Copies of this chain bind each other. A is one copy, B any other.
């Protein structure tokens, strides 16, 4: 029942379709999201942002909580999965999830090896919401409500430098994004 998330063409986002997640702020605001690697723990791959605003990164696909709903809506728990075109460097999943607290940095990082579906305590770390960010794009929000009796973090996602890369983590200042159709989705609006 919530309002649909829109892409840069003004079209409602469709579950199951590929979208680049691109910073709503260009220049020093960077480009799109992608799979990255840390040298101390190369798998699972982490979520990073490309520094070049003309690099849209790797597309993601959204999976709704209600698998019957074709539309991606604001403020509704969903799973997010990178869909790389090239061969896998890691055998962990490319599904986003919130990591365990990192004492070395004070951060709750967005990483991968998440799980699709099965809303439950077991999958709590894999559920994200998309929220409107004022009048400038959207933000990711980790505040799952799939388990009413579970204590959870409830916080927006920002971007933070670590080891020379731009990572995503829970933080006080959300980073805004827009959604751009990947080539496979552009085919869906043309005959």
Interface residues of A (CB under 8 A from B): 100-101, 103-108, 120-125, 147, 149-151, 153, 155, 169-172
Contacts and interface: CB of A to CB of B under 8 A. Distances in A.
A108 B149 CA distance: 12
Contacts of A170: 151
Nearest to A158: B151
B155 A106 contact: no
Contacts of A123: 103
A124 B104 CA distance: 11
B125 A104 contact: no
A105 to B, nearest CB: 7
Query: Closest 5 interchain pairs by CB?
Result: A106-B121, A100-B100, A151-B170, A106-B150, A103-B122
B100 A149 contact: no
Contact of A153 (B104, B121, B151): B151
A155 B154 CA distance: 12
Contacts of A153: 151, 153
